[PDB]
Chains A and B, each alone.
Chain A
Amino acid sequence: QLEEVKQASIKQIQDAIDMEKSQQALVQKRHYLFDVQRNNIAMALEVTYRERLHRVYR
């Protein structure tokens, strides 16, 4: 008797967990990614304004 009950109890929550983790992951990593892709571009930018002021002033 007891065997099959524990087999079901494992499988049901398992499925919850793994999907809820799969959802949560992709949301977070991309919304994070969204902003990382900024940050990359734009860093370049501030550098060149910084640099210009030195460069001309020299």
Chain B
Amino acid sequence: RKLALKTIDWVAFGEIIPRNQKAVANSLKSWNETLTSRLATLPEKPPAIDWAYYKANVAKAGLVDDFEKKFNALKVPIPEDKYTAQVDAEEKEDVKSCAEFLTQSKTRIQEYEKELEKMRN
């Protein structure tokens, strides 16, 4: 593909606790951050060929021109990647957050804080 970025929020990131994916985050930060700076390095593209010249002193200039036309024409596919199941490996330990403790916590918060007033009396 190329670079992407979402909600990189490092403190809560590691914090997860779905344990076989909990551990991953702690490393995945550093794998990532190393990653982020390493991209931040490269050039994207290199020069554009001085074809006018390379004909000059590649006087096998059929080769130059062959490769020239090919280079002028030459347009890479883009990379491979595969972990766009992580999008959904998210949604699972995206409902864990939700269900487990979204709802638990509202429920629990209700009785307790409510539970403040009446026993405050």
Binding site for B on A (CB under 8 A): 8-9, 12-16, 19-20, 22-54, 56-58
Contacts and interface: CB of A to CB of B under 8 A. Distances in A.
Q: What is the interface of chain A mostly: helix, strand, loop, or mixed? A: helix
A9 B43 CA distance: 62
Residues of B contacting A: mostly: helix
Given A41-B1, A56-B76, A57-B46, 4 more contacts: A8-B119, A39-B5, A43-B36, A47-B79
Interface centre among B12, B47, B120 (most CB of A within 10 A): B12
Contacts, number: 194
Contacts of B13: 29, 32-33, 36
Contact of B86 (A22, A27, A40, A54): A40
Interface residues of B, number: 60
Contacts of B120: 9, 12
Nearest to A17: B112
A21 B39 CA distance: 36
B44 interface: yes
Interface in B1-59: 1-13, 15-16, 25, 28-29, 31-32, 35-36, 38-39, 42-47
Contacts of A50: 39, 42-45
